[PDB]
């Protein structure tokens, strides 16, 4: 009902393309191209056009986490690791824009090349799963220039959006952010999840949020539990939908 | 900057599909399917997907007219005659929503089946132009159910949106609105333009806005001048882009 509420609601419907309802790619457990409302609502399909695949439930979660951090004065930036066409990061920048927040940045981290080719340095679960095999099938490889273009279409490409192009094992250890209020992990594999927990989670502020988009994937879950056990983290894992979970760092 | 400004800016980019940049139909003077920014900015193409064809310049004009009416206390509702997929009316309802206006309605008037077949009763300029020829080529026929569906996708289908299905010569004389603050005419022909000026313009409040979307079309322009001459209307005709004009009613 307020201007902010209307803007953020529309931005969610737009980045997920509930407006025009694009077909999905046929891959994984999706056997037909037709737009299905329930699949887009819960982020389960592979949009041919939409700027995010995370769906409405995970967009609502991202809004909750960012708004809570702002409300509670939790310091730091927003980082997404694994951005595809950029829609979740566009939405995050839009939240900051709606509240006229000028002192936080959205960090946009990706290979900008899709999933990595498997080698003998990969975890066996990642090697077996071989996510790389799906790159073309779901149009995953999306260049930095394309993602920048997408931000610009919403009027949200500015100096509060910064990009971290490369493999997370290479980009995360020396990424230039000092503090995070929201760490959103969407890289699917054991490797991508462990890379980012290892190298970015220590910069997550107390009261900040750690979102695991791909917790339904066994390899991803494996990394989450290994990392939490190592660090003695017992913060409640709260389920969002059939894919994602999050916790709030105590 | 403000939530309202951000919402309405996004709503314009969305109904015109600057976000996903759908191809155009190849028709009229548009010779290629590719999205062209300048063509969508000025409302010159025939979107395959977008909910409005009027473009950013005419969306900005609609915003200016509605906001001015609200600011100045001009009484009445908003009517668009010729809505296609509904996007300009969706945007109008969004403007009212952004300002929490609860006492005005957006009236959505169309045949919901494209241009009418020409008959012997048509003006000779309309007969020659024969807009009916283009219906399928640019996917013009769009049912009431489809337009309602489109409103719902934005969360804007509610009791402040009312529909007037049928030919304007049938629906306008007894349309139930009492007063208009904005009258947006987008029916292309002499006939549709004269139908709406004849039967809806008298309900346009002083200080209200009359928008002629299709003024570049000779038959439409003919109707505009005939009507203005008949009624002694000399309110300045202000050009928006390469298609549309508007005036503000002084009397
Ligand atoms: C198509 C791409 C996708 O691929 C699959 O969806 C693969 C699915 C396999 C076919 C599945 O196997 C089948 O299950 C059946 C129940 C039984 C079958 N049989 C034994 C006969 C068996 O063949 C699955 C369960 C295999 C397991 C290991 C799995 O969870 C894999 C995930 C892959 C995700 C990838 C990557 O998409 C990512 O996904 C996460 C969850 C999203 O947020 C998002 O980031 C998205 O990126 C855009
Ligand atoms: C394809 C549908 C469209 O068709 C045309 O765009 C036809 C164009 C003709 C080809 C044109 O002719 C050409 O001009 C050249 C200058 C010279 C050419 N040659 C002699 C060399 C001649 O061939 C035009 C100028 C003909 C004149 C009579 C005209 O203005 C017709 C309008 C028809 C509009 C219709 C209906 O679309 C409506 O359009 C108005 C302007 C929009 O807001 C919108 O509501 C839209 O609905 C969605
Ligand atoms: N090790 C790694 N390093 C960098 N990027 C990676 C990676 N493994 C996967 N990726 C990227 O992780 C993404 C997974 S899909 C991300 C979906 C996105 N958050 C949305 O809103 O739709 C892809 O863009 C892929 O290129
Ligand atoms: N005589 C008549 N009566 C009712 N509707 C008519 C008509 N002549 C044309 N129309 C309608 O006028 C419209 C012209 S195109 C309208 C474009 C629309 N305003 C937009 O925002 O894109 C079509 O939807 C067509 O069905
Ligand atoms: Mg090796
Ligand atoms: Mg690795
Ligand atoms: Mg994911
Ligand atoms: Mg007639
Ligand atoms: Mg027109």
Distance A187 CA to ligand 7 centre (A): 7
Structure tokens at A163: 């990009």
List C-alpha distances in Å: B136 to B15, B17, B70, B118.
21, 21, 38, 16
Distance A215 CA to ligand 5 centre (A): 27
Residues 6+ apart with CB under 8 A from B192: B81, B82, B168, B185
- The answer to whether B191 touches B123, Cβ cutoff 8 Å, is yes
Q: What distance in Å separates the CA atoms of residue B130 and residue A168, rounded to the nearest whole number?
A: 61
- The answer to whether A76 touches A184, Cβ cutoff 8 Å, is no
- Cβ contact B6–A1 (<8 Å): no
Q: Is A239 helix (H, G, I), strand (E, B) or coil?
A: strand
CA atoms within 13 A on the CB side of B110: 25
DSSP A3-17: HHHHHHHHHHHHHTT
Whose tokens are 């309602």? That residue is: B148
CA distance B15 to chain A (A): 9
**H or E element that contains A59:** helix A55-72
Q: What is the resolution of this structure in A?
A: 1.4
CA A14 to chain centre: 17
Handedness of CA B181, B91, B24, B30 (dihedral sign): positive
Pick from A19, A20, A98: which is nearest to B6 by CB?
Answer: A98
Looking at the DSSP bridge assignments, the partners of residue B150 are none
Q: What distance in Å separates the CA atoms of residue B104 and residue B98, rounded to the nearest whole number?
A: 13
CA distance A217 to chain B (A): 30
Helix B3-15 and helix B87-98: axis angle, to 10°?
170
Supply the Cα-derived Rg of chain A in whole angstroms.
17
Among residues A115, A109, A63, A102, the alpha carbon closest in space to that of A86 is found at A109
- Kind of pairing between the strands at B106-110 and B77-81: parallel
- The answer to whether B145 touches B39, Cβ cutoff 8 Å, is no
Other C-beta atoms within 10 Å of B183: how many?
27
Q: What distance in Å separates the CA atoms of residue A192 and residue A37, rounded to the nearest whole number?
A: 30
Other C-beta atoms within 10 Å of B224: how many?
23
- Cβ contact A155–B20 (<8 Å): no
Q: What distance in Å separates the CA atoms of residue A101 and residue A140, rounded to the nearest whole number?
A: 31
Structure tokens at A7: 């803007």
Q: What are the φ/ψ torsions at residue B245 (nearest 5 degrees)?
A: -135, 170
Q: What distance in Å separates the CA atoms of residue A6 and residue B5, rounded to the nearest whole number?
A: 11
Structure obtained using: X-ray
Structure tokens at A196: 């980012």
Among residues B226, B245, B249, the alpha carbon closest in space to that of B237 is found at B245
Other C-beta atoms within 10 Å of A165: how many?
15
- The answer to whether B108 touches B161, Cβ cutoff 8 Å, is yes
- The answer to whether B19 touches A14, Cβ cutoff 8 Å, is yes
Among residues B37, B143, B163, B24, the alpha carbon closest in space to that of B90 is found at B163
Q: What distance in Å separates the CA atoms of residue B18 and residue A137, rounded to the nearest whole number?
A: 26
Who lines ligand 4 at CB under 6 A?
A: B 52-54, 80, 82-84, 87-88, 110-111, 114-116, 140, 167-168, 186-189, 191-192
Structure tokens at B163: 């529909």
Structure tokens at A210: 């750690």
Q: What distance in Å separates the CA atoms of residue B50 and residue A19, rounded to the nearest whole number?
A: 10
Q: Is A158 helix (H, G, I), strand (E, B) or coil?
A: coil
- Kind of pairing between the strands at B180-185 and B161-165: unpaired
- The answer to whether B160 touches B104, Cβ cutoff 8 Å, is yes
- Cβ contact A14–B19 (<8 Å): yes
Residue A85: which region, alpha, beta or left (left: phi > 0; alpha: psi -120 to 50)?
alpha
DSSP B101-157: --S--EEEEE-SS-SPPP-TTS-HHHHHH-GGGGTTTTT----HHHHHHHHHHTT--
CA distance B106 to chain A (A): 18
Query: Which of A30, A40, A215, A217 for a ligand 1 pocket mutation test, highest count of atoms within 8 Å of Cβ?
Result: A217
Residue of B nearest to A6 (CA): B7
- The answer to whether B191 touches B130, Cβ cutoff 8 Å, is no
CA atoms within 13 A on the CB side of B74: 25
Q: What distance in Å separates the CA atoms of residue B220 and residue B212, rounded to the nearest whole number?
A: 8
- The answer to whether B87 touches B149, Cβ cutoff 8 Å, is no
CA B151 to chain centre: 15
């Amino acid at each position: 009902s307020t201007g902010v509420e209307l803007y953020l609601d529309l931005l969610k419907r737009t980045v997920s393309n509930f407006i025009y309802q694009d077909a999905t790619h046929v891959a994984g457990l999706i056997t037909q191209a037709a737009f299905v409302e329930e699949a887009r609502e819960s982020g389960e399909d592979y949009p041919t056009v939409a700027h995010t695949a995370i769906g409405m439930k995970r967009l609502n979660n991202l809004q909750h986490c960012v708004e809570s951090a702002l409300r509670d004065g939790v310091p730091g930036d927003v980082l997404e690791t694994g951005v595809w066409r950029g829609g979740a990061c566009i939405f995050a920048r839009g939240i900051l824009k709606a509240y006229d927040v000028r002192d936080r940045t959205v960090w946009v981290a990706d290979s900008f090349q899709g999933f990595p080719k498997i080698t003998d340095d990969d975890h066996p679960m990642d090697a077996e799963m071989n996510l790389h095999q799906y790159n073309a099938a779901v149009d995953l490889p999306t260049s930095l220039a394309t993602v920048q273009r997408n931000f610009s279409r919403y009027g949200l490409l500015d100096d509060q959006v910064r990009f971290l192009p490369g493999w997370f094992k290479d980009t995360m250890p020396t990424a230039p952010f000092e503090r995070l209020a929201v760490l959103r992990m969407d890289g699917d594999s054991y490797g991508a999840t462990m890379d980012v927990l290892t190298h970015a989670y220590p910069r997550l502020s107390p009261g900040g949020f750690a979102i695991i988009d791909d917790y339904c994937i066994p390899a991803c879950r494996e990394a989450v539990h290994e990392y939490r056990d190592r660090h003695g983290i017992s913060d409640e894992i709260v389920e969002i939908d059939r894919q994602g979970v999050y916790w709030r760092r105590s």
